[PDB]
Amino acid sequence: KLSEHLRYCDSILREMLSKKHAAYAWPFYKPVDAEALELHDYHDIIKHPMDLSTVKRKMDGREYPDAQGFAADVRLMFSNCYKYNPPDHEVVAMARKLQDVFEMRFAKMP
Numbered sequence: 001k002l003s004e005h006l007r008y009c010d011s012i013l014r015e016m017l018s019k020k021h022a023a024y025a026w027p028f029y030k031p032v033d034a035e036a037l038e039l040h041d042y043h044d045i046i047k048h049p050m051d052l053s054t055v056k057r058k059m060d061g062r063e064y065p066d067a068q069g070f071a072a073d074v075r076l077m078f079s080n081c082y083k084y085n086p087p088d089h090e091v092v093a094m095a096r097k098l099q100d101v102f103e104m105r106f107a108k109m110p
């Protein structure tokens with residue numbers, strides 16, 4: 001069983017993976033495939049990869065002790081994108097749109 005706040009977190013995750021947000025969320029659905037995208041320095045710059053599928057694996061595996069642990073991974077995913085990319089990159093705008101969803105839903109958690 002998931003914690004009560006973790007159930008809410010799992011619900012936020014389900015929304016982030018859902019068709020509603022797919023126009024901006026899709027780059028975050030799986031780990032960055034550095035070689036497929038020809039980002040040959042990605043793993044040098046980003047030492048701790050994170051993406052929504054990994055958050056799902058961890059949630060399903062009951063790895064998060066609390067909502068804070070969940071949020072730290074979601075924010076890591078966004079932060080990796082901001083860290084790697086020039087701020088004017090299209091993927092940064094997509095990350096930001098998804099983060100707006102995340103931060104709003106997470107903040108509204110009673």
Ligand SMILES: Cc1sc2c(c1C)C(c1ccc(Cl)cc1)=N[C@@H](CC(=O)OC(C)(C)C)c1[nH]nc(C)[n+]1-2
Binds near residue numbers: 026028033037038081
């Ligand atoms: C599957 C994935 S994962 C991803 C991207 C894609 C495509 C995109 C991207 C996504 C959508 C649009 Cl319209 C454009 C780019 N950008 C790269 C970084 C980059 O420099 O890639 C290009 C070499 C420019 C492709 C990046 N950084 N962090 C992430 C999560 N991504």
